[PDB]
């Protein structure tokens, strides 16, 4: 009930398979003075090693068809087939604590301007009178109102978030827009 | 120092254990013309394979007591014993970029209404005068103010977020409330 | 079958390959125990083990994939997470759904008056109480000048000193007396 392999103290002992003259795979204690135990394909160069404080495989690791990658990323059906890094980015609001100017100029009553970021469901700050930032969080394309410094601004988000239009304002003309980074 | 297994080129070579007449487990290169090396239980049908570009197990994979599931979900004490998908959902604000109406009507000064979701710590838009949406983010049940289109609205979130009351308004009567999806 | 290394045992009895160096049990592979079909690759010296069981495979210690690590508490470390553990990457990268708030200042700051607040208020959700006992919401950006038509009239305020300073620049009948912040 035991196939007994015996070597001298601290000497290698492993099972080696060769097909033809080719080293194919091995399992066991591959080196003298080293107690790591390895299961290795020479042909694939793919390895599992039992080491002192952990086990390791040297390439990506599949669990069924889910994948644990060598960079620590995970892919599987639970993440909608995405890698986890992308699932997270798409799924949850980023704590960037940074903003970006998407537009600068002057947009009086009736004037529509155009930006290269989708402004829908974003945190924005609009600068109108008195060199202050007026906060707003947009929903989808639509009509919004803010009692911005100077008086007030009624504005429209249109064109799938790329259009920003001053519908009407009372002494509160937008001259800059920042957006919180995603 | 080596147990040497030798085969013809590209022929299977493996070690097979049988208990009585039952195939029980094997290790090695299980098939001709295929360099994949496998450690397999025939009884359990549970397998580790070393392949060209990855190593793979065919069922859920435990690391101590933590679990990496075949769908890519992970369970562990670091996630409070939850699966990671649920930890994430519970822990972080959802980037849903979508909204839902929670009430529609007319709530003049003093009028209280029931809303369809708990509005505490939520992103909301209230429509009052002039067909525009006024943004607000609520905290707990309490008293809030917004200089909404038309003038202003002092409002109350009550009844564990299920009640919305117009305390007072100046020419700014609410008629619709949207909430950002969670 | 003459070119397979065949290990044959009685039904439901252990059979494994054991390697010993000198007198020391060093490693084994196979069916370690009677009446039990679990198959194990184990180092006796390291005490590190892989086991194939009925419904799962298991390693008994942290498991590395290249240099990435899946720990026994379910945490993951890797270059994708900036070399951080995923728990910290998540905490640092994404907005907490805390649904709770904390008071960061209480007092009375009229026009021109500046106060110290107890948290960095940059890129935070805050609520300022001015006139009429109501909360006025604002989300801040970095240090800078901001405006809110808060209950009473309006308030132009400044976040300064790396988020630790709050100054009433000017107000119209809307003097701040308390500020709450959403918990991170």
UniProtKB/Swiss-Prot annotation, chains A, B:
| Compartments, record wording | Virion
Q: Which family does it belong to?
A: Belongs to the Teseptimavirus fiber family.
How this chain assembles, per its entry, is: Homotrimer. Interacts with tail components gp11 and gp12.
As for what it does, the entry says:
Structural component of the short non-contractile tail. The tail comprises six fibers made of gp17 trimers, 2 nm in diameter and 32 nm in length. May attach to host lipopolysaccharides (LPS) to mediate primary attachment to the host cell.
Q: Any idea what this protein is called?
A: Tail fiber protein
Q: Which source organism does the UniProt entry give?
A: Escherichia phage T7 (Bacteriophage T7)
Span within the full-length protein is 372 to 553 of 553
């Amino acid at each position: 009930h035991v196939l007994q392999l015996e070597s001298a103290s601290d000497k290698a002992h492993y099972i080696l398979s060769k097909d033809g003259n080719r080293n194919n795979w091995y399992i066991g204690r591959g080196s003298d003075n080293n107690n790591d135990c390895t299961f290795h394909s020479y042909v694939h160069g793919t390895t599992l090693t039992l080491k002192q404080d952990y086990a390791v495989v040297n390439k990506h690791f599949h669990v069924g068809q889910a994948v644990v990658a060598t960079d620590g990323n995970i892919q599987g059906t639970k993440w909608g087939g995405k890698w986890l890094d992308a699932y997270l980015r798409d799924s949850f609001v980023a704590k960037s604590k940074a903003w970006t100017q998407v537009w600068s100029g002057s947009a009086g009553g009736g004037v529509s301007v155009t930006v290269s970021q989708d402004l829908r469901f974003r945190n924005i700050w609009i600068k109108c009178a008195n060199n202050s930032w007026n906060f707003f969080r947009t929903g989808p394309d639509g009509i919004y109102f803010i009692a911005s410094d100077g008086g007030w601004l009624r504005f429209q988000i249109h064109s799938n978030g790329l259009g920003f239009k001053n519908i009407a304002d009372s002494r509160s003309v937008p001259n800059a827009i920042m957006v919180e980074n995603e």
